Amino acid sequence: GMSTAAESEIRQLIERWMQAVRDRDIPGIIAPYADDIVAFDAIQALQFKGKSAYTAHWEMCMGMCTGPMVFELAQLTVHAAGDLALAHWLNRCGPGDDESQCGFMRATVGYRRQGGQWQVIHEHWSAPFDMETQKALFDLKP
Amino acid sequence: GMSTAAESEIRQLIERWMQAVRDRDIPGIIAPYADDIVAFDAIQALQFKGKSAYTAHWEMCMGMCTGPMVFELAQLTVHAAGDLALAHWLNRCGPGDDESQCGFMRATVGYRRQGGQWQVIHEHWSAPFDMETQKALFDLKP
């Protein structure tokens, strides 16, 4: 079954990674990423393939938001067995200056134990949209 | 490391499940779902929790699209180790009558081996959106 030691390690990886995002610390954001990470981000493109391309995307995103930021999580679920792990959570984000602009997105992350370390091999970030308006829904409750 | 036998089983589960969706076969859609499945769907709500609630959502979605359908996949990646598995793929969908309405979404699925069977414990479906327009982007290439 599941490994509580691995799940504890994944939870700590997530804590430091979230903190890196809030600190705008790019080296900390990408440190746990596998070289062949595949990421589905919430915006702009269908996917990013490989750490170099996804780094370039993070660098662009980072430079393009001045001011304070909300980046916090709710309903974290973590499962880990052997060399594979999965986590998912709801992620509140937006401008720390204005909470009228701060909503929930969804997150899923896949991890693999390699070189004696857990690395992120996959991320999927998104907002749901409305069928009729085809607009992203940002004001929804968990 | 990874189990090729488990990954072969997960690939077959995915093949039959996709077919169930195209056949509008609700019993086949939900058959592999764990009772406590957590799903982030592409539309309408942040999340659905539990098989009963997610079944109700599938039933509503299903009844509300007449006509033929595209539901096919590209770039399937599957990893499995012990009692946990992860898959992700790009999913082309839309009206089979009109290909002007047929685009790519992203899919991530988490699986767990329990009761001697693989069950789906998590799904995340989405489209990316545009920052400026906040509209879902449906015409993007893989």
Q: What are phi and psi of A90, to 5 degrees?
A: -100, 135
What SS3 class is residue B117?
Answer: strand
Q: Is B43 on the interface with A (CB under 8 A)?
A: yes
Closest-CA residue of B relative to A135 is B135
In the structure encoding, which two tokens stand for residue A44, read together? 């702009």
Neighbours of B99 (CB within 10 A): 11
B105: tokens are 């979404």
User: Per-residue b/e over B58-89, b at no fewer than 16 CB within 10 Å?
Assistant: beeeeeeeeeebbeebeeeebbbbbbbbbbbb
Q: Does B38 touch chain A (CB under 8 A)?
A: yes
**Of A122, A128, A134, A126, which is closest to residue A34 (Cα–Cα)?**
A122
Region at A67 (left for phi over 0; alpha for psi -120 to 50; beta for the rest): left
The C-alpha atoms of residue A66 and residue A69 are separated, in whole angstroms, by 9
Query: Which single residue is written with the structure tokens 């979404």?
Result: B105
Nearest to A125 by CA among A52, A66, A61: A61
Query: In this structure, are residues A48 and B107 in contact, taking their beta carbons and an 8 Å threshold?
Result: no
d(CA B139, CA B102): 8
Q: Which of B128, B138, B47 is nearest to B94 (CA)?
A: B138
B1/A83 CB distance under 8 A: yes
- CB contacts of A89 in chain B (<8 Å) are none
Quote the minimal CA–CA distance from B41 to chain A in Å.
Answer: 7
Q: Is A137 helix (H, G, I), strand (E, B) or coil?
A: coil
**Under an 8 A CB cutoff, do B124 and A121 touch?**
no
> What residues of A are in contact with residue B79 (Cβ under 8 Å)?
84, 110, 112, 121
Question: Strand runs (DSSP E) across chain A, as ranges?
Answer: 33-40, 48-49, 69-81, 84-95, 103-114, 117-126
Q: In Å, what is the CA distance from B28 to each residue of A18, A35, A130, B32, B86?
A: 38, 37, 26, 8, 20
A84 in reach of chain B (CB within 8 A): yes
Of B44, B81, B130, the CB nearest to A128: B44
CB B105 within 8 A of CB B42: yes
Count of C-beta atoms within a 10 Å radius of residue B2: 16
Do you know the residue count of chain A?
Answer: 142
- The shortest CB-CB distance from A86 to any of B1, B86, B134 is to B86
Q: Is A94 left (phi over 0), alpha (psi -120 to 50) or beta?
A: left
Specified resolution (Å): 2.1
Chain B contact for A34 (CB, 8 A cutoff): no
Amino acid present at A43: I
- Per the CB < 8 A criterion, the answer to whether A97 and A68 are in contact is yes
What H or E segment, with its residue span, contains residue B19? helix B4-22
B65 at interface of A, judged by CB pairs closer than 8 A: no
Q: Report which of B63, B39, B66 is spatially closest to residue B50, judged by C-alpha positions.
A: B39
CB B111 within 8 A of CB B96: no
A27 vs B31: CA distance, rounded Å: 43
Domains, chain A, ordered by start: 1-142 (3.10.450.50)
CB contact at 8 A, A83 and A114:
yes
